[PDB]
Write a protein that binds this ligand. Sequence first.
Ligand SMILES: Nc1ncnc2c1ncn2[C@@H]1O[C@H](COP(=O)(O)OP(=O)(O)O)[C@@H](O)[C@H]1O
Ligand SMILES: Nc1ncnc2c1ncn2[C@@H]1O[C@H](COP(=O)(O)OP(=O)(O)O)[C@@H](O)[C@H]1O
Lengths: 43, 54, 49, 374, 374
Amino acid sequence: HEFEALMRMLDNLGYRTGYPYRYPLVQEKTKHKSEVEIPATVT
Amino acid sequence: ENNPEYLRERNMAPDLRQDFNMMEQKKRVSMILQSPAFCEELESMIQEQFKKGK
Amino acid sequence: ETRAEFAERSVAKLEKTIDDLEDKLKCTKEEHLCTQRMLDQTLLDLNEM
Amino acid sequence: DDDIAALVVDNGSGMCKAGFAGDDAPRAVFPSIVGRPRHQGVMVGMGQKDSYVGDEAQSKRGILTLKYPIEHGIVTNWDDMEKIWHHTFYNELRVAPEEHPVLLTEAPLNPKANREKMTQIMFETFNTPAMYVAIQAVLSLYASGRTTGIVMDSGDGVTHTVPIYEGYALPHAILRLDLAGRDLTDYLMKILTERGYSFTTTAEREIVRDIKEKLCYVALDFEQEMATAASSSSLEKSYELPDGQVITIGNERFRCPEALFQPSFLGMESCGIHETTFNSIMKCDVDIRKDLYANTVLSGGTTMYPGIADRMQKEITALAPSTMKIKIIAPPERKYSVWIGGSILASLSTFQQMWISKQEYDESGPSIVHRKCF
Amino acid sequence: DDDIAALVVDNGSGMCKAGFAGDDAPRAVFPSIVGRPRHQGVMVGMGQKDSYVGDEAQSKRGILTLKYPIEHGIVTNWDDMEKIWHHTFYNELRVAPEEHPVLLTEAPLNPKANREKMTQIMFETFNTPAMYVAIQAVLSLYASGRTTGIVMDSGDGVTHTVPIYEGYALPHAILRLDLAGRDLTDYLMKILTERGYSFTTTAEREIVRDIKEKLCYVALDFEQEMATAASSSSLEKSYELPDGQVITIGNERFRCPEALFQPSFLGMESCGIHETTFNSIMKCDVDIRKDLYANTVLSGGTTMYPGIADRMQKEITALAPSTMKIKIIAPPERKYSVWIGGSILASLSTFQQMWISKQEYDESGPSIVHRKCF
Ligand SMILES: Nc1ncnc2c1ncn2[C@@H]1O[C@H](COP(=O)(O)OP(=O)(O)O)[C@@H](O)[C@H]1O
Ligand SMILES: Nc1ncnc2c1ncn2[C@@H]1O[C@H](COP(=O)(O)OP(=O)(O)O)[C@@H](O)[C@H]1O
């Protein structure tokens, strides 16, 4: 439990910690979408 | 064949002409204005940004 | 010029379909991740049940 | 509004674009150069002006000393800008400036006196009814259909990256970097002198710029590509000069744009563009990081090199945290997008409160633009 | 003599100099010219040859077409180059090249393949054990006694200014200008036509070069000196031709070298040498400019005009900021200084590690010189 919090905090600072998190942090409520978007990504 | 509409066309560089053709086909400005939700959303953005200004 | 026009329309449609398929891939990875972590948690628990 | 459309004039450092608001295409795009004759004219009756502006100047490259009024995004010759604006209003569009509003674009970080001088010039001489100043990088996101994302812009003047968060430009996280197309052209000369081809005058700089535009690409892996170019001659291509000579560019095609990613080639001690974008996102708060990695828009003239998109995606993936949503959104018309965003912004009905009246300027001097336009 | 001593060969466009390692003075200095007869020869049984090389070519100027093998610092006829090198090794020095190593000097910015050619015809034909190639202007700084400073070298073929910091040169700040003494000789021949005297063949160009070497100087102020020549006739000198005629050049004494500072006389776009070295300094970092102003060293044959140092110092002080101090360094033997630097470089014990071995060349082909020589 503790080690994930430490890895998450180092990720927030910016160290590229490769430790895989067992559960997601934030819910990430769906943002506000427009149809006239160019479709993303470079494929 | 003496009007200036002919004149600029042969004074166009070719790539600028072709970019005009492509973005003519593409019609970005018309789509942004025709979409209701994003249009009134950006209206709200600029309106209350102005309201925050003065 | 006409050939370029076909190719442009085909590009647009196909790249939108690429985005849809990639979103499906993302959903499938998170299904793996949930099942794999909970299987590993079951192994760690070592419960007869 | 209905009777008169606002003039959308984009003043790029290399090119100048102009058109009417609410229209899809700009009416006139021309180079922002001014040339003066360098040789004595002996033909009495053929007619020689004191100076040539725009496309007329670029037609007669051989007898002129081309000068750029905008240098590194900073105006260094204001009466020269008066000439380029006079040429834009009267010759290219054939419309009077006193009967229509005008829209001006600007770099995200410019001196206050520059804005004051633009406002004073636009009101005092041209006597325009209404004007407005917009940030160049903001309008690209409006043309993108977005209100939240990071905008990378690269023109002939300077390359800067900004974050935009529901139409708000964060002033602290805007980052600047002096890797423009002109420096790439100069490095193209510096690497072309190896093969044996020498270009030294300002006339040949346009030839070198055309070579850069037509025959360049970005390597996905530099180390593998140098070995590939050394092994075989399949990468070599030939270009045909205006005097009829034929040159073989060969190895240098993926060496010209590589100065963008590694600025140590040009002698600059700064970091690459990928590190600049990464640090720009790093300076913002945690909450908006997810929608900045998941939303990146490329814009500017320099960003149309083939293969820049995949290389940019890989280099920003290498610096991002693990299992991070990374995507690059590059429109095909990415270096006409600022004019498109300007016309879009001028098209709205709630935008008409942004206009600065002539009475307001006459009351409050040239310093009213900063209070009216934040 | 007991041990094999290296040969230091300085090879520019104008003259070739050759000497032994560690010596104070070069043994041979002679013009780099290859002449061929043009007139019909009817005198059977006496001395005729199909080609004349070296000082013998300039002795019999009246029956030859003089032809310089090196043009603008670039070798354009390799057979004449081999003939020059053969005459250097055997006629003048009279030592076989297979016993001793050789050291060559070359221009900073140049076509790549030239170095390869300088490799291939030196190991294959002359069978040297080892060689090395060094930049010409670094040796001037080594001979002056300084490890840090900016050096201008303006020979007969090309002008170049390089800044060197801590004895270790900066490639990005190297500036090269194609304006040298031969163009000054051509300009002097063109402006001597206006007085009535005409010079058209190759021997006349040699005579005009002698006139330039005898009677030229650089004015401290161009306008004041021109008005002074407009006032009186004290600025007139008489030169006696090999025919026996006497010419009075007068006003043209300070107009020929003035093309160095104002290249608009020749129609070239590039500006003078002083702002060239000013831009070379400005391309470097801010911290090192203080040492660069105080350590400016002049070198090359063209920099032996009287009054060049004062005019150069005045112009570069006008360009420099007022708080900075300017020091010009003009050695009295600057014309040979590069060769002197070579004699320093062939005497160092660490330099024994620098030599390109014959076995290494046989292993790696002619491309060994890029990786071995810096
Ligand atoms: N089709 C193209 N291919 C490659 N490079 C291009 C192309 N079009 C423009 N460029 C580069 O973009 C630069 C022009 O940038 P521009 O968009 O005018 O800058 P600004 O944003 O200041 O208007 C030119 O120097 C040119 O090198
Ligand atoms: N004393 C002098 N006064 C004026 N000009 C000179 C003098 N000596 C040499 N020059 C010019 O410099 C040229 C020789 O330059 P030099 O340094 O020998 O070239 P390099 O050594 O690079 O071959 C000559 O052609 C001549 O025009």
